[PDB]
Design a protein around this ligand. Structure first.
Ligand SMILES: [Cu+2]
Ligand SMILES: [Cu+2]
Ligand SMILES: [Cu+2]
Lengths: 345, 345, 345
């Protein structure tokens, strides 16, 4: 009865090794139908234990990187050929071209969490991992004929047999630091940082936008919706809950309700009205990428600055049960904007 | 034997209330196959009796508005938040973003017809209607928990129970006035007004172009076709008929023939040669939107200015049965261009 | 066991007449699945014997023309109406809009080969041919009512019965000359000419890029891959062979191997590592169009200038079995770049 929320476990696992876990959430078209326009997107995550390394690789796919926890040092290379390497702490955003080869090192004493947004460039809603070391079958040097390897590298074939044979995580104007930006919505009850294509050319490729939201203890992000963007948001830390009105689940809306437990992913389509509560005990951080966000507007149904306030009184009078001015009693009554103090029970 | 034409009745109805009728034509992939590249488009219409109001709402979808009959006053709002309201008479074009909330009033003593072109932003070829009042299930305030409503609006929950509870049509650089523009084709036998993306940034989003065609009594729009654009055209007023050559219905063309009765919709794919007759009795107005029109050329097979005239004689000589000059006897013989006097019988 | 390669015969034939052969390769979704993101593309070819003519026509589809063998004179017209005609020798590239009408003449004493890349504008991965002469069913004048023809052209209907009745190949800032451009990769062992969207606005439409590759006798194009572009490449002249590592054929790579015999087509998806050998006896020319190439990078796994060289030593040390410097022994050892001397046996 609730399609839009995926659990920790619903992640299709990729690796599961001591040094790290790299796993991708299944596409949006197994399970549901109502998610289609985002199907060429895949949400994935990465974990790498302290003192870890990740092999040089690439994807036939576009990646949007957002680091959740810890720290790592990133490197991207392409081809005349150029090198770019960066410092990644919590709340960093990177836009990694398809075919662009990248490695990384987690040199740090606690874990490293990284959330990727991957758009397959080849087969729609299907991507993969092109890798330098592993398997009898797993290297893009290792698998090739020794005659063509030996020819190509200009070195003796038995000597090749000792280097490129002898998975990905082992022991050890591109980036923009997201959390180091200016919150579009802050107040007291929570803060939201956002990087969008309209301000950031590097995003215009991947089509998407990147964000990080915090809602304080017992806070709330008021009912509202996204113009165009379809957001996929992951639960970084904490717990909470949400209500979203769904027409598909015949324009009658049924309420979609649920709790956000750590390591979950919620999908919030364009124009979907949503309100979010950050729970009695702890705070809640959501971290995640919107699909299709360009000139995407967020419109609020409550709070001081919202859409109602900007409508003529007559509209309000005919629409609801309220008067020419007495409308303002109702919609200016939330003294805060965006986030405010939420429900109980 | 004729896919491209839909009747009045083939419209999937939405409302059917005294004050108004809002209905959407089914997509193009029930029935046929040959219409695919336009499937993410949906043609819809709106009728609102005199002294009528339409609720604030939005769609997860892009809308291209063209008013057919009568008059109405339009309003759009989004979110810092801004208001835009406009005057709409016959032949007005508006481009309404997804998620952008809009209301309208028909204050006028005759009916109001409005034709919408809707592109689903969420689920391809599937859109919907996000609404403020109706149902036990039908409001995006009404359905939400009173605890989150009460929290969010900062007002007592029983007091909420008397306002947001107590369908859409009830009793009561965005727009450009299309009919007030300059006809690309006029002569005597008919006049055609067109607004295209290449001249109009607001269209570049929605990808489409907007047009209104009049063909006089017994007039004709000569055989021709659209470069790229796939046109969906509705029959505003009058009656008439058409011939269009279809290869799908194996490059052998079969003739597609039919009559345009009021309230119909014809689809004319890119490169589809078409000729149109405005009938013995009355005139014919077509009103409608082209899909995929950018730098879209219209090429004419007859009439003074047309494509043949600009080809070398040798081509014409080898191609048809005609001579080096005697080709010009054949293709300059229509003394008019575009529209001319049509057939009989 | 090898999807990516199509034979001469796998071409869906269109015409087969003495004066010419026009045939289109079937789409990429009969046979395989792994080719999807290119399905709206169709590769086609054209052959026209000496002293031949091709009718004025158009497609509901975008064409990218590359001439292989011989010579022909090209003409394009659209609509106010304009004419453009050009000289085409071996290695010429043209970008032909949908709906744009075109004819051609092979006036020359040997054959004429032309490779087209066609993107359906109407029905995805489905295009067609709009033609002036043939059939009882085959003309877009011939099929139309005489009443509407006679009306439209302003000439007597029996007189129409003697001109437009009395297939396509019969007896007889748009173009850029590709082979007359500057090779991006040359050395001795082979030369590669390329025209891309990023340098050529006319390509930005069709989305694609155009190329011609020569690999000398016993030459090789070293293992490498394309960032974004999915290349479809045809075998102009000669023979040869290739190895490409495929993950789909579960990130374990299996080697895809084969021989390129004349008149074949190979598909090389984005990020697919490939090495190519030009065979013991003759040389090898590949001719063809990349899909989705914008800012598409080609990255090399061997050869003096390649991606490894630009990575830090520590990466190389952890990755492979090699030392801080002794890495450079391995990857700078190919004294050439791009093409070099290949295997034997
Ligand atoms: Cu929904
Ligand atoms: Cu057709
Ligand atoms: Cu593959």
């Amino acid at each position: 009865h609730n399609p839009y929320y995926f659990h920790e476990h619903s992640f299709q696992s990729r690796f599961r090794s001591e040094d790290g876990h790299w796993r991708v959430l299944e596409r949006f078209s197994q399970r549901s139908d109502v998610l289609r326009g985002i199907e060429n997107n895949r949400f994935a995550i990465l974990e790498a234990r302290p003192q870890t390394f990740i092999i040089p690789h690439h994807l036939d796919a576009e990646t949007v990187l957002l680091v959740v926890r810890g720290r790592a040092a990133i490197t991207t290379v392409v081809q005349e050929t150029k090198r770019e390497s960066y410092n990644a702490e919590r709340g960093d955003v990177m836009v990694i071209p398809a075919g662009a080869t990248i490695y990384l090192v987690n040199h740090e004493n606690e874990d490293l969490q990284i959330v990727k947004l991957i758009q397959p460039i080849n087969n729609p809603g299907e991507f993969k991992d092109y890798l330098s070391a592993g398997g009898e079958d797993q290297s893009y040097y290792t698998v090739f004929s020794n005659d063509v390897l030996e020819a190509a590298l200009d070195i003796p074939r038995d000597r090749l047999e000792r280097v490129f044979k002898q998975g990905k995580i082992i022991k050890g104007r591109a980036l923009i630091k997201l959390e180091n930006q200016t919150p579009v919505y802050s107040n007291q009850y929570g803060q939201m940082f956002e990087a969008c294509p309209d301000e950031f050319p590097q995003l215009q490729r991947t089509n998407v936008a990147a964000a990080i939201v915090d809602i304080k203890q017992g806070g709330m992000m008021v009912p509202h919706f996204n113009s165009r963007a379809t957001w996929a948001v992951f639960v970084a830390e904490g717990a909470g809950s949400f209500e979203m009105a769904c027409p598909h689940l015949s324009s009658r809306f049924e309420r979609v309700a649920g709790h956000l437990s750590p390591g979950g992913l919620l999908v919030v389509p364009a124009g979907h009205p949503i309100a979010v509560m950050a729970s009695p005990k702890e705070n809640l951080r959501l971290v995640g990428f919107g699909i299709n966000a360009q000139n995407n507007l967020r419109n609020f149904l409550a709070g001081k600055e919202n859409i109602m306030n900007e409508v003529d009184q007559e509209a309000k009078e005919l629409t609801f049960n309220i008067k020419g001015k007495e409308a303002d009693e109702i919609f200016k009554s939330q003294r805060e904007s965006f986030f405010t103090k939420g429900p109980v029970g």
